[PDB]
Design a protein around this nucleic acid. Sequence first.
DNA 1: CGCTCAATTGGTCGTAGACAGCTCTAGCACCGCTTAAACGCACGTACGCGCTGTCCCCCGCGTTTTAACCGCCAAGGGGATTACTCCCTAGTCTCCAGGCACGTGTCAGATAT
DNA 2: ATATCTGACACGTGCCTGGAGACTAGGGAGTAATCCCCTTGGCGGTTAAAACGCGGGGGACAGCGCGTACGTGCGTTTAAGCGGTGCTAGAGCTGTCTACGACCAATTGAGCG
Lengths: 92, 94, 91, 108, 78, 81
Amino acid sequence: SRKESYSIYVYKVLKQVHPDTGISSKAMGIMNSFVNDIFERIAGEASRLAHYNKRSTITSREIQTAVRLLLPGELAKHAVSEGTKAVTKYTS
Amino acid sequence: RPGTVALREIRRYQKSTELLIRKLPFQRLVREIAQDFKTDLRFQSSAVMALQEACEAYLVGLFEDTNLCAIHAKRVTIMPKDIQLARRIRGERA
Amino acid sequence: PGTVALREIRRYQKSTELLIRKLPFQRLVREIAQDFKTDLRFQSSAVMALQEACEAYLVGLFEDTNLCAIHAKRVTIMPKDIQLARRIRGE
Amino acid sequence: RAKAKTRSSRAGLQFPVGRVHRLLRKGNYSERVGAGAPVYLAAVLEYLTAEILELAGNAARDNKKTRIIPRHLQLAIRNDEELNKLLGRVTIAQGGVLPNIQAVLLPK
Amino acid sequence: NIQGITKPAIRRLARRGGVKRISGLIYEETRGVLKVFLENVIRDAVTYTEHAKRKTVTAMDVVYALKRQGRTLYGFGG
Amino acid sequence: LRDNIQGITKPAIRRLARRGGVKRISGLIYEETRGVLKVFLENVIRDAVTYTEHAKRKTVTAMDVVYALKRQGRTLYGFGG
DNA sequence: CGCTCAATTGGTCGTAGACAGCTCTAGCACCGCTTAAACGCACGTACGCGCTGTCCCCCGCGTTTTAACCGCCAAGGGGATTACTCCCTAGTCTCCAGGCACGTGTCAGATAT
DNA sequence: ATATCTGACACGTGCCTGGAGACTAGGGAGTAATCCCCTTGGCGGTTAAAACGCGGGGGACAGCGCGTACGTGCGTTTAAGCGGTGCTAGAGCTGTCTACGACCAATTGAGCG
């Protein structure tokens, strides 16, 4: 049975800025932690935002509010800018 | 004339859970601070003064062992850099 | 001189690798385990993860300790000057 | 009925929205899940990953290296307080710590 | 108007906290520390309200802000 | 044979104090340092045992330490979890 | 107070481990088309606990001279670092021993096809 | 009755796990000179303390509203599902080169002259 991880997607996103650059498995392990730590933070926050308003769905506006509370700076509205682009183009 | 044995406040403000800031100036304060994100809010009087309680209890938490940090430095007198010690160790400013 | 210790700081910051000897750490870990519950075996990497997390706790404690001594006008550590950490942090 | 595509390809994302939907569902986080949520989440994962990897590239380049090791990510974080306010509760395994001498300790 | 946090208010708070000596240069920077604390707990709280489309800053949303720093309290609908 | 915690050597604490960025080391520090380290293991390994015993396993995994560190807030990367 | 010269550092030899494309294999979980129930929108309609000013004393600031105090250089030796001194147990590594999931056992039957 | 299959009634090795031993030598330890640091003290140099009478604004009383609240119709949404079919990891061994070090002339530091 398989291990499950994010290695190929993090190594894909690395080419989005540094196609010149290689990776050690140890650094791959750090990024394979960082990815699902952001998942652990957001998904719980969104489920709690739903629960704080008694809802059966986590939602686009739930995750937008969770991310709005994940970083205390410009990076939050940059993340919102990427997410609004994604949900817009998916649904158009 | 000079004071002496200045303990009289210590034997009052730790005896009961009295509230120390006055309402209306704190009321405009939080409201005028909120509106730089979003104006045309309405504010529950309970919600603002609950934040007054939390700010006051947190201000006990901004002196209680902060004066112990000065005592570790062998000052009886707190100086601003003590906050820059204690509040960096708690991670609230870096 | 009495002081090339400052170049030790920079050298042990050029370095990153774990500082405690492996088997010695495992002995301490097992001698904390074997009178807590019966016969705890450990995978090597779990012992290494414990070692890293604990050496990180200690490096952080000493970083706070430098602030404690320096803010007390010392460039030397003393036990009381560690002991501010346990009461100020949370534990 | 036709040959398939990932939802990410319509979203303009490279991250895998479908397994995000699976991780939410296997995560049991609510009775239903708005399709907008995992689509947005994939962009969080990209944007937060690319930003730190760029700085990891800087740390490696400046130390004249060509393969990333945990050191580079740790220094990439400590070069940026907007990352330090996220990762301050986190240890980067084997990256060590920021090389730093406080000015009171120096000679003269 | 941050100046509404007056000198005797901070004397009273610190004397509940058991303090002895201060140098007067403490207070004007400590007003700034309370200003950033107060601003952080406000912006987090108000967000839940406006996200829930309510315009009324709700005491629940004050609890859910303080709860994200773990500083739980009851009576306000918890 | 020696069980007496000295495996945390003078040379080890010396180097940890160095990497934390501290200078002169008076001899009183070493035994107190061993104490705080013990108390931290006695927080983490306690819950690691609860993770091992929740599965009724007889061996501690990397997951068993990682989730114990995670629930105690001093989170760790590089090992899954 | 700028020199001698000892102490960390930086370019070349060469070697050897962990990446990176495997290498399709391929085992399977993402999407498509259905099936489909129900919650949250959309939306009236209840309407308080929000925003909005007169009388009235209190909450905070400015002023008295000053020392508890922090920071000063004065006084005051111990014990940590550096260094060379030896004594020892970390790491290494190869062989020991024993646990699990296995396929077919082996023969023959508790339960009923 | 019949076919057959289903636990008693069980000696056959990989993989895996952890154990314990002797040598080697990396390094912990042992001791001591002695500097440089923490230091031990008190005004002397510089500034928090209730007033004490006094100015700045908060509060017990009134007075209106579109918000904050229910809770029904319903339509849009995801759930849940099964086939088809694009994805992702195994493990096998490169093709390395990149990082790993030792050898062997640079730059950074301790002594007073």
